[PDB]
Amino acid sequence: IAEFKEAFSLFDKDGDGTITTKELGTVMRSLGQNPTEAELQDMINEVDADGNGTIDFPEFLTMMARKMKDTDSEEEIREAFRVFDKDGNGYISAAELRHVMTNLGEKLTDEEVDEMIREADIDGDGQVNYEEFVQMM
């Protein structure tokens, strides 16, 4: 319990006791992502609980305490798939899913898509049942 001190200190390089935009940007650049100032702004804003522009340690605990598999969040993933379903029947073609996940948004690489298509689509036929795929995730 409370091993998050290590990660929080890793993010807090200068040790002021808070996480600023510059530190987050430097850590991201250490991984070669090269984000813009705006993305860092939204990322910090989405966690900020006292509305000061920085991230304190208890806010870090609060953010890390959240968990998935809640219905209010599972419904979002369910609704996201229904945008591409042309009939709402619960089936989507493998080729369409591959094209969408490769050529839009985050643009995953082919290797991640291939692992995904084997973790799902146990049916093997032309249509993939995405409801159980969402359930597993």
């Binding site: 953010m63 996201a80 945008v83 029947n89 619960g90 996940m101 839009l104 948004g105 995953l108 690489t109």
Partner: protein, 339 residues
């Protein structure tokens, strides 16, 4: 995929061809009711029974065949596939109503007028399949739950007090023919219910000047509290309608929808140390937190894409643009002070 084609026709009609079919079914059902009404009248009692027999014997068969076809066609959706999936479909209230009415009609024809007369009324609940009217009314009422409770409570309290006062002022007065109209609190309450809902049958009227004065002061004020829910709900409906003209176009929400799913999958994939997502060793602890933040950012961005336009989006857009231009201007500044 003729199964889906049939299910679309029976459950999810959109065309004029399906509209004609549903209209014909509804009008046949409505025609069935009218002959039931005329059967209670003594003059037409005889012939109506024999007509209704031959109407019912064909209508129960028509509805019975339709139910089993509807049940089979429901398996095209993955939500209802499998035996348990189909048993999940029959759990819906509309299917329950249809099954109940079919079984009751069959049993009635096997063996009572007070039952078939009620069954022919319950049959009217068949026309609406998707439940849209209830799905709209319930939401609109649920949004305004507080004010409806407030107005109903206040109106009920006013009725209770005013009726007791009128009973006190009226219990000793005789009518013209002679029958104490307000001889009990129940009669005064029955009078009060008639007046607040502005019906006014006129069977009970106050006789003394005190009662008339109290009723006059009561009507002009407590009547409004019972016509108020309609005024609230109509305005709510109109305001809800107005928002439909400011919808963000459906074509523009696709990238956010894709991004949400991709970020969620990337956040999940970190659990396997040998997953290919690592191909882009204590840095993984920070990588997981970065992906955790990105998931929340994507989820927040998805919700805004399904809401109508508002001033908050303008404020946020100006916020982003201002700092973008600001940092570029500062960069050009620094480039100048370099020399």
């Amino acid at each position: 995929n003729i199964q889906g084609r049939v299910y679309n026709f029976l459950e999810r009609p959109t065309g004029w061809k399906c509209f004609v079919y549903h209209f014909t079914v509804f009008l046949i059902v409505l025609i069935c009711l009218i002959f039931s009404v005329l059967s209670t009248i003594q003059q037409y009692n005889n012939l109506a029974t024999e007509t209704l027999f031959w109407m019912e014997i064909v209508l129960v068969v028509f509805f019975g065949a339709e139910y089993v076809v509807r049940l089979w066609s429901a398996g095209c959706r993955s939500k209802y596939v499998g035996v348990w999936g189909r048993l999940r479909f029959a759990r819906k209230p509309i299917s329950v109503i249809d099954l109940i009415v079919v079984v009751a009609s069959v049993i009635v024809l096997c063996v009572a007028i007070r039952g078939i007369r009620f069954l022919q009324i319950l049959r009217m609940l068949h026309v609406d399949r998707q439940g849209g009217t209830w799905r709209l009314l319930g939401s609109v009422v649920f949004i305004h739950r507080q004010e409806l409770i407030t107005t109903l409570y206040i109106g009920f309290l006013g009725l209770i007090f005013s009726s007791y006062f009128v009973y006190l002022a009226e219990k000793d007065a005789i009518d013209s023919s002679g029958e104490y109209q307000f001889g009990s609190y129940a009669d005064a309450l029955w009078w009060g219910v008639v007046t607040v809902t502005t019906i006014g049958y006129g069977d009970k009227v106050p006789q003394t000047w005190i009662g008339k004065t109290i009723a006059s002061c009561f009507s002009v004020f407590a009547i409004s509290f019972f016509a108020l829910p309609a005024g609230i709900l109509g305005s709510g409906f109109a305001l809800k309608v107005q928002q439909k003209q400011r919808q963000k176009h459906f074509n523009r929400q696709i990238p956010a929808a894709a991004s949400l799913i991709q970020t969620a999958w990337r956040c999940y994939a970190a659990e396997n140390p040998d997953s290919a997502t690592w191909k882009i060793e204590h840095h993984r602890a920070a990588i997981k937190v970065i992906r955790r933040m990105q998931y929340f950012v994507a989820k927040k961005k998805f919700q805004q894409a399904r809401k109508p336009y508002d001033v908050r989006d303008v404020i946020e857009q100006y916020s982003q643009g201002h700092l973008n231009l600001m940092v570029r201007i500062k960069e050009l500044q620094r480039r100048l002070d370099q020399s």
